[PDB]
Amino acid sequence: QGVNCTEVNVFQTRAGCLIGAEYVNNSYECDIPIGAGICASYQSIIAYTMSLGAENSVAYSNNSIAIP
Amino acid sequence: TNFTISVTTEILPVSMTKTSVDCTMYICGDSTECSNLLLQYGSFCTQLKRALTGIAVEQDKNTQEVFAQVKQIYKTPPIKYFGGFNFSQILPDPSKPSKRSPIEDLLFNKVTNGLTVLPPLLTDEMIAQYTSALLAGTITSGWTFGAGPALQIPFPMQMAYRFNGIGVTQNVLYENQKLIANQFNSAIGKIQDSLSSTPSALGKLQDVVNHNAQALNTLVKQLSSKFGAISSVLNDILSRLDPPEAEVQIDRLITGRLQSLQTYVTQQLIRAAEIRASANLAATKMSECVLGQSKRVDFCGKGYHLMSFPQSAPHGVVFLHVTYVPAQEKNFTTAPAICHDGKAHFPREGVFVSNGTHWFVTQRNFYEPQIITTDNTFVSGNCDVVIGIVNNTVYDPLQPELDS
Amino acid sequence: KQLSSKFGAISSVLNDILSRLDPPEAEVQIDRLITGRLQSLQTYVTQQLIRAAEIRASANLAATKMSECVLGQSKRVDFCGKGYHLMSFPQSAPHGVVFLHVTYVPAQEKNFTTAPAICHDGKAHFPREGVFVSNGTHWFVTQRNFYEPQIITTDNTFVSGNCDVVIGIVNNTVYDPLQPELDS
Amino acid sequence: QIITTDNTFVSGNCDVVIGIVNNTVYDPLQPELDS
Amino acid sequence: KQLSSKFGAISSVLNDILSRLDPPEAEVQIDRLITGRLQSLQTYVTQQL
Ligand SMILES: *[C@@H]1O[C@H](CO)[C@@H](O[C@@H]2O[C@H](CO)[C@@H](O)[C@H](O)[C@H]2NC(C)=O)[C@H](O)[C@H]1NC(C)=O
Ligand SMILES: *[C@@H]1O[C@H](CO)[C@@H](O[C@@H]2O[C@H](CO)[C@@H](O)[C@H](O)[C@H]2NC(C)=O)[C@H](O)[C@H]1NC(C)=O
Ligand SMILES: *[C@@H]1O[C@H](CO)[C@@H](O[C@@H]2O[C@H](CO)[C@@H](O)[C@H](O)[C@H]2NC(C)=O)[C@H](O)[C@H]1NC(C)=O
Ligand SMILES: *[C@@H]1O[C@H](CO)[C@@H](O)[C@H](O)[C@H]1NC(C)=O
Ligand SMILES: *[C@@H]1O[C@H](CO)[C@@H](O)[C@H](O)[C@H]1NC(C)=O
Ligand SMILES: *[C@@H]1O[C@H](CO)[C@@H](O)[C@H](O)[C@H]1NC(C)=O
Numbered sequence: 114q115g116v117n118c119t120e121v122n123v124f125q126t127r128a129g130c131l132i133g134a135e136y137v138n139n140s141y142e143c144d145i146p147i148g149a150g151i152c153a154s155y156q157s158i159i160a161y162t163m164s165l166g167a168e169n170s171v172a173y174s175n176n177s178i179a180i181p
Numbered sequence: 182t183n184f185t186i187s188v189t190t191e192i193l194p195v196s197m198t199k200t201s202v203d204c205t206m207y208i209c210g211d212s213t214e215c216s217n218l219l220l221q222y223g224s225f226c227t228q229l230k231r232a233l234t235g236i237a238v239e240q241d242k243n244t245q246e247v248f249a250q251v252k253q254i255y256k257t258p259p260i261k262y263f264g265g266f267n268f269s270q271i272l273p274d275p276s277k278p279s280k281r282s283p284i285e286d287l288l289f290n291k292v293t294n295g296l297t298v299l300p301p302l303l304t305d306e307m308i309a310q311y312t313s314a315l316l317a318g319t320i321t322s323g324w325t326f327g328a329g330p331a332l333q334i335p336f337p338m339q340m341a342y343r344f345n346g347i348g349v350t351q352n353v354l355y356e357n358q359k360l361i362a363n364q365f366n367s368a369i370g371k372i373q374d375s376l377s378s379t380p381s382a383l384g385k386l387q388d389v390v391n392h393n394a395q396a397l398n399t400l401v402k403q404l405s406s407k408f409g410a411i412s413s414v415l416n417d418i419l420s421r422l423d424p425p426e427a428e429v430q431i432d433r434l435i436t437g438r439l440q441s442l443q444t445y446v447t448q449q450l451i452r453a454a455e456i457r458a459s460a461n462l463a464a465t466k467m468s469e470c471v472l473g474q475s476k477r478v479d480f481c482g483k484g485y486h487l488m489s490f491p492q493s494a495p496h497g498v499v500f501l502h503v504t505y506v507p508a509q510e511k512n513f514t515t516a517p518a519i520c521h522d523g524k525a526h527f528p529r530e531g532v533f534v535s536n537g538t539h540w541f542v543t544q545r546n547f548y549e550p551q552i553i554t555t556d557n558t559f560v561s562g563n564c565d566v567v568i569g570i571v572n573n574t575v576y577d578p579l580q581p582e583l584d585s
Numbered sequence: 586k587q588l589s590s591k592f593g594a595i596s597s598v599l600n601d602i603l604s605r606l607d608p609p610e611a612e613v614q615i616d617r618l619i620t621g622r623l624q625s626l627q628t629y630v631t632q633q634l635i636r637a638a639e640i641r642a643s644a645n646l647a648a649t650k651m652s653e654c655v656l657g658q659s660k661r662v663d664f665c666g667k668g669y670h671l672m673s674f675p676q677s678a679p680h681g682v683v684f685l686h687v688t689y690v691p692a693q694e695k696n697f698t699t700a701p702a703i704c705h706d707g708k709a710h711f712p713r714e715g716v717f718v719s720n721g722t723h724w725f726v727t728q729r730n731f732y733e734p735q736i737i738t739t740d741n742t743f744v745s746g747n748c749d750v751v752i753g754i755v756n757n758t759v760y761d762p763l764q765p766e767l768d769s
Numbered sequence: 770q771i772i773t774t775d776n777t778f779v780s781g782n783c784d785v786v787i788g789i790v791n792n793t794v795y796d797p798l799q800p801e802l803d804s
Numbered sequence: 805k806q807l808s809s810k811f812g813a814i815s816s817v818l819n820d821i822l823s824r825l826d827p828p829e830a831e832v833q834i835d836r837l838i839t840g841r842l843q844s845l846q847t848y849v850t851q852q853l
């Protein structure tokens with residue numbers, strides 16, 4: 114917790130540093146909270162940035178409508 | 182006979198700064214005699230640690246449940262034309278690299294041993310993205326996106342629906358769309374100018390940040406208290422005094438520090454409970470006054486509710502309520518019913534309004550006089566049982582329709 | 586577990602101290618044990634009171650939820666279930682309650698072309714409760730939450746204003762049902 | 770009230786509604802067009 | 805009601821305990837007394853909050 118571990122796979126976060134887990138470029142949905150949006154899970158134990166959700170882009174037209 | 186839209190902003194705190202303490206580090210630090218003596222008191226550290234971790238979990242849940250109300254991040258279209266409505270002061274600007282709105286930047290610029298600070302799970306960027314996604318969903322999809330899939334609904338269509346939802350029929354907006362757009366732009370400009378005009382506007386967030394920091398302070402300041410002992414230094418008493426006397430002095434110091442720590446834990450628990458209640462109220466307002474239209478009067482803004490927009494704010498949130506104030510009134514003379522051919526007549530949805538000579542029917546919130554016609558009136562009973570009736574004629578289209 | 590703590594005394598067992606020590610020193614031993622256990626009991630009472638206040642707040646919220654979602658229908662969005670709320674079932678739970686929200690969730694959206702109003706014979710037309718929806722050739726009205734096309738008829742459309750102040754209008758005829766009725 | 774076309778709206782056909790009954794409906798302007 | 809309690813001291817009166825007893829033990833006795841009174845005030849403030 115908040116220790117720059119230069120005197121003790123090592124990854125550095127804003128909440129401290131994590132030892133024993135790697136980093137993933139892509140983002141998954143997490144269930145274990147850490148802090149500063151860097152979640153960890155078990156697919157070995159991997160650490161990744163949080164998924165904000167589905168990146169759904171909706172269109173818009175001042176002349177159009179959608180009815181279910 | 183006229184309407185003026187006023188924008189009112191309210192501030193509700195969401196989550197305060199998580200705080201974790203260490204028992205041996207704050208109480209003893211380095212003296213092993215204090216560490217040996219602390220075991221005589223029993224389990225008075227695990228309870229405090231569990232309490233502070235539960236508080237941190239509750240605050241993380243509080244700051245998660247107020248913003249993560251959608252499962253899809255909605256993207257604002259690159260075009261910024263919605264029918265004359267300038268929406269530039271609250272949408273994110275790509276020029277600033279922090280993805281910050283001018284309102285968000287203005288409100289962010291107006292907010293300033295053994296005590297570690299746990300950073301929140303949600304920093305400013307993800308909550309800014311959440312507020313941007315909710316703003317996009319409420320500007321391009323109406324209130325439908327809070328129920329199921331988002332449907333492409335135009336902004337004039339959704340504001341006409343919101344006008345129809347407060348009992349005003351949709352025959353008043355489209356005649357003066359430029360006027361209402363100019364009024365909305367002027368309201369946004371004046372609320373942007375007056376948001377930072379007074380330093381007491383952002384009262385609650387500044388108050389809770391002040392209370393917290395000072396709280397930690399007072400907890401730090403108790404280390405320099407003698408507590409009835411010779412000195413307030415652990416190494417000074419042990420290396421100078423007779424060890425039976427040092428036992429009593431360290432016992433008094435440790436029980437005073439434990440009382441101070443328990444008082445701080447109780448104060449933090451009370452503050453966290455109040456913050457949780459305020460976060461529940463803010464979540465109710467977020468799930469009601471943003472994801473839909475609320476018919477509760479004086480619940481979101483001073484006036485009839487139309488829509489509201491969320492803005493990200495550190496450790497809190499500020500709402501931008503858009504109200505409906507029908508100023509510049511003008512009075513007339515009325516009657517509860519109209520007598521015609523021995524039978525009473527009643528308005529379907531409006532009220533019979535007379536300007537002195539003739540009679541008209543109009544809506545309950547706007548002066549739009551219409552001729553009395555049998556299509557929007559119904560008959561019931563006779564003319565005798567009803568009181569306050571007047572004698573007048575009613576227009577019927579079949580009389581000129583049949584002979585033509 | 587706080588009973589086994591010595592609290593700085595000779596021993597945690599009270600009977601051993603009371604049968605082992607004279608009252609000149611048993612007085613201060615009893616005093617230390619009494620004040621330690623009293624402080625522990627005060628902490629326990631404070632935590633119990635805070636937890637009971639939390640339970641009272643949660644129970645008041647649940648009572649409001651069952652009063653506004655079981656005894657009736659609540660029109661506000663996303664209070665009882667994710668979507669349009671119809672009604673709910675209460676269920677008995679040990680030390681709690683569990684609701685069964687029945688939600689109305691639309692699906693299978695379809696693209697359509699709309700217009701705010703239709704101008705006909707110099708006067709614009711506005712619907713009672715629907716919206717003008719066109720599939721490409723003709724124009725129909727339908728409700729806001731389901732697709733049900735109907736012919737443009739003068740009973741569900743009213744006139745207001747002229748054809749100039751309204752913007753985004755389209756040109757289409759309006760079917761008057763009285764004209765073929767009077768022709769028979 | 771007498772069931773008329775002013776307070777009723779037509780939809781669908783008489784083949785799918787469960788529990789529908791046989792009844793004629795009053796229509797307005799019926800002694801009006803012939804007089 | 806808690807103001808007039810002995811709190812494990814010799815007496816509960818300031819003038820009775822600051823005159824008869826010697827100051828090396830009267831200081832400790834009045835320290836225990838004011839500690840108990842401060843605990844009572846903290847508890848009363850807790851229920852008030
Ligand atoms: C809406 O109004 C705001 C405020 O005037 C406009 O923002 C200005 O944009 C111009 C051009 O980029 C800048 O030179 C100003 O400095 C901006 N002012 C502020 C304080 O934002 C915005 O462009 C307008 N948007 C629309 C849609 O008209
Ligand atoms: C509408 O016209 C009727 C016509 O009868 C009025 O009824 C009469 O009112 C006068 C004055 O109150 C009475 O002296 C008569 O006895 C009433 N006759 C009947 C048959 O009612 C009625 O008052 C008029 N109402 C209004 C508001 O003008
Ligand atoms: C839009 O909907 C209308 C209504 O169904 C369609 O019009 C029908 O077209 C079929 C195809 O020839 C005809 O058999 C029907 O008689 C038409 N209906 C009426 C009431 O005349 C129209 O084709 C649809 N347009 C598109 C592009 O899908
Ligand atoms: C840790 O220390 C090194 C060297 O002092 C520094 O480069 C690095 O930025 C530090 N870590 C963080 C998170 O600041
Ligand atoms: C809205 O209408 C204007 C009319 O000039 C048009 O330029 C703009 O592209 C339209 N936007 C959408 C979303 O259809
Ligand atoms: C209503 O007020 C606005 C400004 O508040 C003004 O421009 C307008 O002329 C007034 N009257 C009408 C009928 O809109």
Ligand SMILES: *[C@@H]1O[C@H](CO)[C@@H](O)[C@H](O)[C@H]1NC(C)=O
Nearest residue numbers: 535536537538539540541550
């Ligand atoms: C009342 O309104 C009608 C039409 O709106 C008008 O002919 C009449 O002169 C008005 N009467 C007064 C007293 O203004």
Ligand SMILES: *[C@@H]1O[C@H](CO)[C@@H](O)[C@H](O)[C@H]1NC(C)=O
Nearest residue numbers: 171172173333694695696697
């Ligand atoms: C409707 O049209 C938009 C833009 O043309 C498109 O992005 C969207 O997928 C369409 N919806 C459906 C259901 O085809």
